[PDB]
């Protein structure tokens, strides 16, 4: 017998492969597995781990987010890397000439980036021209902006959104929500 201080046969809890059957994604995973093994650059390891992520853990990254990231000093000539989708944004009216490498570009995002003088690039061409992740800039999208996150942690005084179908007066705005009707949360 052994006095087990820890739970036995415990899986790491991390994805080691994409959950999908996309063969082109699996080819990208194979390429960045080779790069994350034969190169010591932590960029290839971070890109490889991001290639395993689910959809909610790969939020889209807008072109306005990319332009804001390019307003940083020393980052004008960098290569923006989005392991996921670059969506479009009409809120902006100027776009810098830059190189963006991403899994997917929406039609609007690709048009805006190309019209700005830049180029859209896949992660394999990213690997070819920047094998060690030279002057790259990895961007991620907002994960807690998801609508499901609003209801996480519901409870008294937590200030969270109830899981509700119909919204308005007569829908959970009474006893328990105001002092005049019983109490307030």
């Amino acid at each position: 017998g052994i006095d087990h201080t820890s739970k036995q046969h415990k899986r790491s809890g991390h994805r080691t492969a994409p959950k999908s059957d996309n063969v082109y994604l699996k080819l990208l995973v194979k390429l960045y597995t080779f790069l994350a093994r034969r190169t010591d650059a932590p960029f290839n390891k971070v890109v490889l781990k991001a290639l395993f992520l689910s959809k909610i853990n790969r939020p889209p990254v807008s072109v306005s987010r990319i332009a804001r990231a390019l307003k940083q000093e020393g980052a004008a000539n960098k290569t923006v890397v989005v392991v996921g989708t670059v969506t479009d944004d009409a809120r902006i009216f100027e776009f810098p000439k830059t190189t963006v490498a991403a899994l997917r570009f929406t039609a609007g995002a690709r048009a805006k980036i190309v019209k700005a003088g830049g180029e859209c690039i896949t992660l394999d061409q990213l690997a070819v021209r920047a094998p060690k992740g030279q002057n790259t800039l990895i961007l991620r999208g907002p994960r807690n902006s998801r609508e499901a996150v609003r209801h996480f942690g519901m409870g008294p005084h937590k200030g969270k959104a109830p899981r509700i179908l119909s919204t308005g007066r007569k829908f959970e705005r009474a006893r328990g929500r105001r002092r005049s009707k019983g109490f307030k949360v």
Partner: protein
Amino acid sequence: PSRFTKTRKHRGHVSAGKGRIGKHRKHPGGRGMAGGQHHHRINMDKYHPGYFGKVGMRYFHKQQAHFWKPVLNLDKLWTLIPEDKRDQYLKSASKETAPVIDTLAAGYGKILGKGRIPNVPVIVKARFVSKLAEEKIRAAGGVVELIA
């Protein structure tokens, strides 16, 4: 598909995953929202505060078409001009030739002010407009023409 469900996996195991003690029964706590004030009170008050009681005043025969008023912010305002003319209108900001935007034709009731339009004068026709939105349009050099 049934072949992927846990019902197939429970074959040969007596209780079908329901327990030998609890012994899956018909409606052990009542049907629907039974006991919302009595034995489901903790769940109701924790997850749905505000459920019980009346708040506000009634509206007999409410027609939602009276309250039709889609809102549009100034940042999305320039999306109403088609892209074939958007670049041309964006450059060479003219006081004598400014784009006319019929937001009502685009299906909007009130123009709001989430901000930062370029300093290009535009005519913005709207039914309702917010104070800050009209200030921002006039700051850019445009005008708001109220319509009905």
